[PDB]
Design a binder for this molecule. Sequence first.
Ligand SMILES: CCCCCCC/C=C\CCCCCC(=O)OC[C@H](O)CO
Ligand SMILES: CCCCCCC/C=C\CCCCCC(=O)OC[C@H](O)CO
Ligand SMILES: CCCCCCCCCCCC[N+](C)(C)[O-]
Ligand SMILES: [Cu+2]
Ligand SMILES: [Cu+2]
Ligand SMILES: [Mg+2]
Length: 429
Amino acid sequence: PKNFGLDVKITGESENDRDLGTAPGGTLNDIGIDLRPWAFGQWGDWSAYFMGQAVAATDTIETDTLQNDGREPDKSYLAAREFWVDYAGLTAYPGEHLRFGRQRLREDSGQWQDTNIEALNWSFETTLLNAHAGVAQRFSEYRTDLDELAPEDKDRTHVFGDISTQWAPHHRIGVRIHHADDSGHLRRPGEEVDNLDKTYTGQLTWLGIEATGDAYNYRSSMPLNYWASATWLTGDRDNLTTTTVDDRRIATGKQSGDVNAFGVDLGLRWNIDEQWKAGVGYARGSGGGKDGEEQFQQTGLESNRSNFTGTRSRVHRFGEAFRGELSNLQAATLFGSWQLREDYDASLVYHKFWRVDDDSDIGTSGINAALQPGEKDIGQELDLVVTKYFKQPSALIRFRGGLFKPGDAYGPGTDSTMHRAFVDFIWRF
Ligand SMILES: CCCCCCC/C=C\CCCCCC(=O)OC[C@H](O)CO
Ligand SMILES: CCCCCCC/C=C\CCCCCC(=O)OC[C@H](O)CO
Ligand SMILES: CCCCCCCCCCCC[N+](C)(C)[O-]
Ligand SMILES: [Cu+2]
Ligand SMILES: [Cu+2]
Ligand SMILES: [Mg+2]
């Protein structure tokens, strides 16, 4: 058991243009280094881990796919990524352990949780039955450049769980729950409201079923793989109301409404042979409705990145460029993928996006530009991921790129094309 190491990453990012040319900046053409020293110890059923991070870049690029004066990042910073203790001795099951601290929370779809966060998480993974249960909350960014949490994350508590069984070899059915609460943390009327304050609070519960047949298993022995999930979002959100007096904003009350939304994601992958795969996907997050109540949203812990193309490399489920969130969004996707032993892989993904309700914004982490009322046609995207794995979890060099072609929903004076591309070189010592 290796007690220390150092992960070294060099990243280049090209982005143009996040705002489709409508606002200033929003593009990237830059390079950076990301150094992650780590430490690990193990003593019987216990273990503990720390990973820190030092980054220096020519601009504020994304070196980690998992991510106000207080919220402007610096080109360079130090951070604590993970720090936890783990106990695996409750049961003899090796996939069963309890982890406490800032840790990687992930499920295979990436659509519920895929992030580093302070948490207490119990995992129970066996051949016939998988289960998890945990609680999480952000208390800090643990970063030298960020002094404060984003208001949405502040005092927001997450509680979640899942259970599933393998009813035949490689065919799984399960349910999953997540609840996020930050209710009652709004400014009471009379108080001054800063840029650091919340504009809303919520109590939200996601309830999902999910069936998978080696959905995210790149080494599947089956000729066909699939995923299917349906997720119900319910609860309510209180919207903070304000007024401005003498150049100072101030709380006046709140406006409340129920949330009642629904999301679905379906996919089918043909394992043509040991190297070639192809597939189709469909996903939809409901949108709009009375006071946004039919507006699906995700937990806020998601990456939407997964091995859905059937390779070791994870790919953004809704485009490297568009980076859609499943929110008032319909997407149809087509992909093919290729790999050669453990040395290389590659994926080509096409997406088409539509709005569900043409008078509501969509779910997006990649494009910052206003939509035209009454237009459903968000656009199309083509993505390519290519990776080489070196002999010395493994060193790699990877290209990740997305080309997005905005549809009629973005309208006049917007660029006809936008891209976001990365090259990452990663070496482990
Ligand atoms: C269904 C689309 C799958 C992706 C197709 C586009 C792939 C584009 C470039 C792949 C480049 C991979 C190069 C791997 C390589 O250099 O192999 C060297 C020898 O051929 C084997 O060692
Ligand atoms: C500025 C570097 C940009 C790199 C972009 C990511 C490319 C990722 C994989 C492409 C691999 C192409 C070269 C493959 C290679 O090095 O072959 C070496 C083998 O020993 C030949 O069999
Ligand atoms: C080289 C290992 C890096 C570990 C150091 C991580 C420190 C980041 C947290 C310190 C607090 C930063 N803050 C909140 C004051 O801005
Ligand atoms: Cu711009
Ligand atoms: Cu098997
Ligand atoms: Mg155990």
